[PDB]
Amino acid sequence: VGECVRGRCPSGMCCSQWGYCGKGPKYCGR
Numbered sequence: 001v002g003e004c005v006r007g008r009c010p011s012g013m014c015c016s017q018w019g020y021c022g023k024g025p026k027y028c029g030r
Contacts (some may be wrong), residue, residue, distance in 0.1 A: 004015040013021050014028035021027065 002021075003019040004021050007015075009015045009021040013023055015021055016027045024030075
């Protein structure tokens, strides 16, 4: 359901290797 738009994040967040959006090293890798 909540996975990255249907492929990306909002213009400022990072899509994790879980396919889910956020910030920090679980999401941006840094």
